[PDB]
Coordinates of C-alpha atoms in Angstrom, one line a residue:
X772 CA 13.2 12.1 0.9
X773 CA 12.2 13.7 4.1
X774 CA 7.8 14.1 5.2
X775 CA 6.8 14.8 8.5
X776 CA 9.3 14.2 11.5
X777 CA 6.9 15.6 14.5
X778 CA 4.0 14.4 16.7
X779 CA 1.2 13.4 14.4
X780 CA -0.6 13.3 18.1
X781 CA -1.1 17.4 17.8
X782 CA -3.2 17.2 14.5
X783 CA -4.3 14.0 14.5
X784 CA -6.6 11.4 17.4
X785 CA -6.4 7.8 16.5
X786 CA -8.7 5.3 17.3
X787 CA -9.9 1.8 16.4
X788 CA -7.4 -0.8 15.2
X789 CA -9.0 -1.6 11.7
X790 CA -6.0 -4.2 10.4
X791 CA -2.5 -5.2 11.7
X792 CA -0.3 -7.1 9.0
X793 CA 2.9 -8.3 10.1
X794 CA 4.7 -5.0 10.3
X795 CA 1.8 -2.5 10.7
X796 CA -1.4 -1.9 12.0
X797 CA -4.4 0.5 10.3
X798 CA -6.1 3.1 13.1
X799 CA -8.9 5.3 11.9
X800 CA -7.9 8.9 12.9
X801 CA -9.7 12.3 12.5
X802 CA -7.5 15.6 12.4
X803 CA -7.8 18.7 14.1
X804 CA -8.7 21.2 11.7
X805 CA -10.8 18.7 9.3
X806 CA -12.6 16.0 11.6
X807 CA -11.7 14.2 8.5
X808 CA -11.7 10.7 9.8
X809 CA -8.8 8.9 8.4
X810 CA -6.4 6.4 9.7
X811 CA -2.8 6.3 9.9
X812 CA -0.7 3.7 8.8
X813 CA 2.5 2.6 10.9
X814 CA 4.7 -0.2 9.0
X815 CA 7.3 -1.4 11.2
X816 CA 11.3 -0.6 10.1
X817 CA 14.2 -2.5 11.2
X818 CA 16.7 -1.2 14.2
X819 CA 20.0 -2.0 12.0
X820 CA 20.4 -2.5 8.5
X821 CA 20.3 -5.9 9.4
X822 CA 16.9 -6.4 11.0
X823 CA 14.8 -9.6 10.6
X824 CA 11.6 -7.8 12.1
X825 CA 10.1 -4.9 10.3
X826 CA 11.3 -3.4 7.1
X827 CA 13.8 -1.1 5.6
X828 CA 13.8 2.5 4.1
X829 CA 13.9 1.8 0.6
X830 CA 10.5 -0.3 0.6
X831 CA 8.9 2.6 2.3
X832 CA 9.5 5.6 0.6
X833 CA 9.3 3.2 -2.4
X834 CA 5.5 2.5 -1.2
X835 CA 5.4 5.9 -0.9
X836 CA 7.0 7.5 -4.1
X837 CA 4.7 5.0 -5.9
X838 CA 1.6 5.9 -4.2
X839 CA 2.5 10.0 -3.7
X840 CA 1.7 9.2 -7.6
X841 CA -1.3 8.1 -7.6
X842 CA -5.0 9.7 -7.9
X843 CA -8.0 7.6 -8.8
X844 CA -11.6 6.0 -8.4
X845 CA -11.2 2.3 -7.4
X846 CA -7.8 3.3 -6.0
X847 CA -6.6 4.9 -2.4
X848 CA -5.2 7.9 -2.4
X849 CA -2.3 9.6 -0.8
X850 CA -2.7 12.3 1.9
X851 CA 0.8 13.0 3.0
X852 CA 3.7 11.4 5.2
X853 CA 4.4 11.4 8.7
X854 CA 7.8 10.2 9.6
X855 CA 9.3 9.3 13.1
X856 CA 12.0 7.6 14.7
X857 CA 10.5 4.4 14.9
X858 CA 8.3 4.3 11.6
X859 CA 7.0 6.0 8.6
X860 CA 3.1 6.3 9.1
X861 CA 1.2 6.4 6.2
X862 CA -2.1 8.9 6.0
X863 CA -4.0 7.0 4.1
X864 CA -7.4 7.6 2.7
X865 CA -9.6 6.1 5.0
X866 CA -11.6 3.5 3.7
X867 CA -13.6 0.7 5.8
X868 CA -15.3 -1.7 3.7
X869 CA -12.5 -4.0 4.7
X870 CA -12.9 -7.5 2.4
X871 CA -15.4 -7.2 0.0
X872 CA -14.6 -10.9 -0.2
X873 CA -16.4 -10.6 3.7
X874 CA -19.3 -8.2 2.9
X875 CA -20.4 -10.6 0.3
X876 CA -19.0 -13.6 2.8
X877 CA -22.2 -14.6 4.3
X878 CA -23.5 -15.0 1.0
X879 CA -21.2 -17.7 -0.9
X880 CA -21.1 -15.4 -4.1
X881 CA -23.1 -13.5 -5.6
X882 CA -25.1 -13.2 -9.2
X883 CA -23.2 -12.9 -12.4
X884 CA -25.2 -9.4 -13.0
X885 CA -24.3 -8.3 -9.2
X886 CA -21.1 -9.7 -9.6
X887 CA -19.5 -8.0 -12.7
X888 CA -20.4 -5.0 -11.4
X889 CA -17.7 -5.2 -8.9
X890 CA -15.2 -7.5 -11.4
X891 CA -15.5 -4.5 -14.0
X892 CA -14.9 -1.5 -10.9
X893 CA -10.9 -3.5 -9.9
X894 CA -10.8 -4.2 -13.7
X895 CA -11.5 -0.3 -14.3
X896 CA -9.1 0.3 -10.7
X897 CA -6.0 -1.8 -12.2
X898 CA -6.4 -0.2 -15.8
X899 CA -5.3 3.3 -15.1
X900 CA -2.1 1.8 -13.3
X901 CA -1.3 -0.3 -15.9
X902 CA -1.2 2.5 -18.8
X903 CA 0.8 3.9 -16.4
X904 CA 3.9 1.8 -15.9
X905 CA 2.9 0.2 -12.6
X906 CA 1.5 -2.9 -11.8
X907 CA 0.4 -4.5 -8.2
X908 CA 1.5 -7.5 -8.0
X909 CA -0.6 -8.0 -5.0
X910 CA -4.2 -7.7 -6.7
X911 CA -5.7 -10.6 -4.0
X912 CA -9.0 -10.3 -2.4
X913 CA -8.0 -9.9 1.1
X914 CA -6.8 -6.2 -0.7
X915 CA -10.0 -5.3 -1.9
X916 CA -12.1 -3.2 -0.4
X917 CA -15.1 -0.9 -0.5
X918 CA -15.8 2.5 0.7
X919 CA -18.7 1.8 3.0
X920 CA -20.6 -1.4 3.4
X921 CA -23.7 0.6 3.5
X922 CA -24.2 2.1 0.5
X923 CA -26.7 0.4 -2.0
X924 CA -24.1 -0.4 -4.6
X925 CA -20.3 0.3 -3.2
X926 CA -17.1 1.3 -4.7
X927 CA -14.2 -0.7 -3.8
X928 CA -10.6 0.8 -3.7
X929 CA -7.3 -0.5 -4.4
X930 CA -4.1 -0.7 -1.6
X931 CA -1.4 -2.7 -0.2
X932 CA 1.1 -1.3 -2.9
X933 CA 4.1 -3.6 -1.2
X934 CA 4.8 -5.7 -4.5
X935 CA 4.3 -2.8 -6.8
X936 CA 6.8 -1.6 -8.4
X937 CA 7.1 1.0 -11.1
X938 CA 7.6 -1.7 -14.2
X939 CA 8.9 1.9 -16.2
X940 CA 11.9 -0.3 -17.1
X941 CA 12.8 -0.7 -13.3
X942 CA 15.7 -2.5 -12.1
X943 CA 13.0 -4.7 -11.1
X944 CA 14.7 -6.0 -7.6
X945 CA 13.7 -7.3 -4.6
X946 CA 12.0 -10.3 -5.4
X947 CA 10.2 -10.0 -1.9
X948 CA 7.3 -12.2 -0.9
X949 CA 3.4 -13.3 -3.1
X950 CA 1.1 -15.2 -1.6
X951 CA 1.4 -18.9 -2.3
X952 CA -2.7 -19.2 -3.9
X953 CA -2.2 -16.2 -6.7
X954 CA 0.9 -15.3 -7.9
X955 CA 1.4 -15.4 -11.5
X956 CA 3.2 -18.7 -12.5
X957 CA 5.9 -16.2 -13.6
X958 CA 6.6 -15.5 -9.3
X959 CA 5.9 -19.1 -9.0
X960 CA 9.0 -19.8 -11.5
X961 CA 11.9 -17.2 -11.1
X962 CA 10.9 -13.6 -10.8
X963 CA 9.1 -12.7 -14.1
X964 CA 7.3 -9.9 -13.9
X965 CA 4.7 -7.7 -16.0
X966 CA 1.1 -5.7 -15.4
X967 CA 0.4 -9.0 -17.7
X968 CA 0.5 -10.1 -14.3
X969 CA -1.9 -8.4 -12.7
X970 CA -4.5 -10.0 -15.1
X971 CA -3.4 -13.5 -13.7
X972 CA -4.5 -12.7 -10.3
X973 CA -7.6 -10.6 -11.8
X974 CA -8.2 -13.4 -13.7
X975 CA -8.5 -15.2 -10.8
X976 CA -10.2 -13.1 -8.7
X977 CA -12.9 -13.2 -11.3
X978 CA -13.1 -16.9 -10.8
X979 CA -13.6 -16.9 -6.7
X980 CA -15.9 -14.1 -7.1
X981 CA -18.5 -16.1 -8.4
X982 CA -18.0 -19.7 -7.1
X983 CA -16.5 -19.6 -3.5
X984 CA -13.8 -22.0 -4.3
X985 CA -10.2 -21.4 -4.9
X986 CA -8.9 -23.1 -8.3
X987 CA -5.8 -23.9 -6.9
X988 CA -5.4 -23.7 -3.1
X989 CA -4.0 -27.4 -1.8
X990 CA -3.9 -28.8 1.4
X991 CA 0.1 -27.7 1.8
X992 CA 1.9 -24.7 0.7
X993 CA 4.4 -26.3 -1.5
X994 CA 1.7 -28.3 -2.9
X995 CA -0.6 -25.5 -4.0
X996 CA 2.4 -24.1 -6.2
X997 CA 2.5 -27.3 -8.1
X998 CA -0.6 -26.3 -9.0
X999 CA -0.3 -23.1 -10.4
X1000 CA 3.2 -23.1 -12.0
X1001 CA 1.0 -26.0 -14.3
X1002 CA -2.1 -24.3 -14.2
X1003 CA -4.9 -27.5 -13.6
X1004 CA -8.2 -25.9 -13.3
X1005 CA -11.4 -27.3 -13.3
X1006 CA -14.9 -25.7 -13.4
X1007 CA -16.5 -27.9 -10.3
X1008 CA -20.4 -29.0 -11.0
X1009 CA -21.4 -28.4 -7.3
X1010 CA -19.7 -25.4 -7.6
X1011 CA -20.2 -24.1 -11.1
X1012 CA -23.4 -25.8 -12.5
X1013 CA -25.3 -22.4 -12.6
X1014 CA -22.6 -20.4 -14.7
X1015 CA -22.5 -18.8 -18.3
X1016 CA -20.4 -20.5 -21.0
X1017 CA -19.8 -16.6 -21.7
X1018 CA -19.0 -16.2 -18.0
X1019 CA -16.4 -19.5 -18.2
X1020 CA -14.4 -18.5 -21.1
X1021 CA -13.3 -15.7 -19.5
X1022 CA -11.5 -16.6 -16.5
X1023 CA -10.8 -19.2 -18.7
X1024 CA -8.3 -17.2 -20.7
X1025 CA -6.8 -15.8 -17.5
X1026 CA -5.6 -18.8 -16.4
X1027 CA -3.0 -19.6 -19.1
X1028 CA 0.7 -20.2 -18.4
X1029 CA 2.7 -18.0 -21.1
X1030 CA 2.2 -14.4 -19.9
X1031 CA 2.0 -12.8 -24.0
X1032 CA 0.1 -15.6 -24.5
X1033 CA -2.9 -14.5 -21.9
X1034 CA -5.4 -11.6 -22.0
X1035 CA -4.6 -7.9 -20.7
X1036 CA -6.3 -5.4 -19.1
X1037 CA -7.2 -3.6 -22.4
X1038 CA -8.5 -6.6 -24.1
X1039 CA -9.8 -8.0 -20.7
X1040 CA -12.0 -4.9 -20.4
X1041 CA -14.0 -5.3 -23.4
X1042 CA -14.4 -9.2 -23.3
X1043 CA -18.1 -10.0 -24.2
X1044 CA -18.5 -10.8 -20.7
X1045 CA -18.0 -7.2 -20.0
X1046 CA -20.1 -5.9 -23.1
X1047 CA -21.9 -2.9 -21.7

């Protein structure tokens, strides 16, 4: 349905360019009753219904619909929607800590301790979706962020709601793009599906987290893939020596090919390794 079709430019001032996909680009903003810095969000459309640059309507106010549903911690929220011609701008709620994949960059990992501390705030972030009928999908660290890398101890958020789709029941279309180092083996192998999912890449996540080395990443796109759809990890010594049995097992049990057959959210979030 309709939002906003006027000039965001009277109530809100733009500013720096924080990201730019490959139809969009993230601005901080402030408004002009609030000085509440935010940033809109422009994703680019598609002239005809026949466009190869951009993106169509349904996508949008699908993006939209599923996030004007939202309200949570670890999770972005939804301010409202500003529509013109050329794009839909979403007001999202600012956040900045960009990849906490690049806070923590400089520093190869982290500390098992440390480290759960952020596995257990996404593990916490996806939950609430889940028990609610809608997974990501696109649950890959470039997406995670925090909400200021100054605070002592920071509290990431959740975005990029492209893949995610209501899995209500869901005439679960589109098919669409993942990105070739952590979608499920389901993606890899005709379209599955499931929030079962979302522990895959979680379960991955998890694993890079704490190592600084992707389990399946290959020199070649197509190549990679082979590796997932088999699922051939392999705790590296160099790279693993100083990590907890405990710790192992549970990644462990999120790399696993049958979907059914590998953990959940739920079960995930009380796993010893997350005994608080």
């Amino acid at each position: 349905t309709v939002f906003r079709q006027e000039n965001v430019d009277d109530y809100y001032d733009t500013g720096e360019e924080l990201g730019s996909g490959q139809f969009a680009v993230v601005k901080k903003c402030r408004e002009k009753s609030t000085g509440l810095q935010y940033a809109a969000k422009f994703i680019k459309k598609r002239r005809t219904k026949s466009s190869r640059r951009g993106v169509s309507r349904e996508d949008i106010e699908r993006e939209v619909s599923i996030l004007k549903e939202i309200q949570h911690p670890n999770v972005i929220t939804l301010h409202e929607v500003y529509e013109n011609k050329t794009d839909v701008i979403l007001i999202l709620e600012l956040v900045a800590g960009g990849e906490l994949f690049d806070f923590l960059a400089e520093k190869e990992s982290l500390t098992e301790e440390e480290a759960t501390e952020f596995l257990k705030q996404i593990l916490n972030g996806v939950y609430y979706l889940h028990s609610l009928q809608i997974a990501h999908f696109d649950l890959k660290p470039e997406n995670i962020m925090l909400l200021d890398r100054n605070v002592p101890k920071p509290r990431i958020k959740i975005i990029d709601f492209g893949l995610a789709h209501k899995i209500d029941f869901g005439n679960e279309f589109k098919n669409i793009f993942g990105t070739p180092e952590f979608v499920a083996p389901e993606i890899v192998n005709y379209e599955p599906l499931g929030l079962e999912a979302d522990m895959w890449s979680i379960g991955v996540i998890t694993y890079i987290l704490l190592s600084g080395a992707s389990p399946f990443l290959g020199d070649t796109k197509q190549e990679t893939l082979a590796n997932v759809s088999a699922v051939n990890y392999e705790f590296e010594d160099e790279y693993f020596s100083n990590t907890s049995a405990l710790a192992k097992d549970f990644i462990r049990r999120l790399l696993v090919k049958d979907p059914k057959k590998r953990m959940t959210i739920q079960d995930s979030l009380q796993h010893p390794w997350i005994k608080p």
